[PDB]
Amino acid sequence: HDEVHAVLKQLQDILKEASLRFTKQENFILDQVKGVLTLQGDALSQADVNLKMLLHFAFREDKQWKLQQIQDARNHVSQAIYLLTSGAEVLKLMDAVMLQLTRARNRLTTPATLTLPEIAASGLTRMFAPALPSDLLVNVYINLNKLCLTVYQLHALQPNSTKNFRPAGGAVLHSPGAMFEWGSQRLEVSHVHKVECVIPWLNDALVYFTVSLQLCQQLKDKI
């Protein structure tokens, strides 16, 4: 059997192209909310958010917000390459490479489950100039190939309220009516505005992962 080395070469070529995707388009335009986000590798370098009530919020231009899903995916790809560039032996190599690839895909596919207090306390909240008002939260994450911006409008519970208060748990996206404690207040999500844009090089990366995983499984099956 010699096809093992051919497969290892094809994997190295593909994954190096995939790695190049993480290291063209940078500016992305994201109905109630209009965003202009600049994405450089794993760094959200600028975020120009306009909410229709237009309230305008922007990052301070010094600072950048890292998207952990992209950084992690990048490191998984880099490690798949390292495993390659460094019978049952072939199968163990294939399992280790496929493990890195499936982790890279999963990190892009599965954004964090956060509580509303976690969103409010995130450094992302404090990225904005001028500061967000107390009745607005901003969340940003990657959903497979999409850059996703969520803006939550909040409403405090009124005095002598008849409403039942049950604190929301964690969620990727919270629904209107979700409630949480913040400081001396109990707040309800009144509105959820979600805008998203496809990131072409992320889609390219995902396709490369799919191809690579298929090539690994093909080789495993021949042994």
Author numbering: 24 to 46, 57 to 63, 69 to 91, 97 to 129, 139 to 275
Question: What does the paper behind this entry write?
Answer:
Rogdi is the human homolog of Drosophila melanogaster rogdi, and is a predicted leucine zipper protein of unknown function. The human Rogdi protein comprises 287 residues, and is highly conserved among species including fish, fly, frog, worm, and mouse. The crystal structure shows that Rogdi resembles a boomerang with an elongated curved structure comprising two distinct α and β domains. The α domain consists of four helices (H1 to H3, and H6) that form a left-handed four-helix bundle through van der Waals interactions.
However, we were unsuccessful in producing full-length selenomethionine (Se-Met) derivatized protein, due to poor protein expression in the methionine auxotrophic bacteria. Instead, Se-Met substituted Rogdi was produced and crystallized using N- and C-terminally truncated constructs (residues 11–276, referred to as tRogdi). The structure of tRogdi was determined by single-wavelength anomalous dispersion (SAD) and refined to 2.04 Å resolution. The structures of full-length and truncated Rogdi are almost identical, with a root mean square deviation (RMSD) of 0.8 Å for all Cα atoms. The N-terminal amino acids 48–55, which correspond to the direct linker between H1 and S1 in all molecules including tRogdi, RogdiH, and RogdiL, were not visible in the electron density map, indicating high flexibility.
